[PDB]
């Protein structure tokens, strides 16, 4: 799957991941990728922000989605 | 500081928060008190919705204010 995910601040980055990841997992991505750690990152989708312990798919995550990253 | 939370059967239920604290570190209480989890819930102050990174003083969040707790039908 690939999803992309947007820094409020702009920018969309691709992410190219699985459907069984975690937030937390997909947060860990977006550390290389950005630079900042994971418990200084906020995931918001479609209105809501997601807990890191259910996956892509429990929020119905689907391929080519865009995620928004919020600092903390 | 204590401040109320009107639950899903309209009961009323009181929580310890401070001025400072998200919305996000509120909810958590509120799954605390009612196992509701933090992604289904919906708190409305002032006939509003209010989003996790704000803190209750950001909303001017006076000792004893009775928010709202909504459940989350759905969204996305």
Same mark, same amino acid.
């Given at each position: 799957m690939q999803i992309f995910v947007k820094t409020l601040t702009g920018k &969309?980055? &691709?992410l190219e991941v699985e459907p069984s990841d975690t937030i937390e997992? $997909? !947060?860990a991505k977006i550390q290389d !990728?950005? #630079?900042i750690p994971p418990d200084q990152q906020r995931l918001i989708?479609? #209105?809501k922000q997601l807990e890191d312990g259910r996956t892509?798919?429990?929020y119905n995550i689907q391929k080519?989605? &865009?995620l928004?990253? $919020?600092l903390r």
């Open positions: &969309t980055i &691709t997992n $997909v !947060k !990728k950005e #630079g989708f479609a #209105g892509l798919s429990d080519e989605s &865009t928004h990253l $919020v």
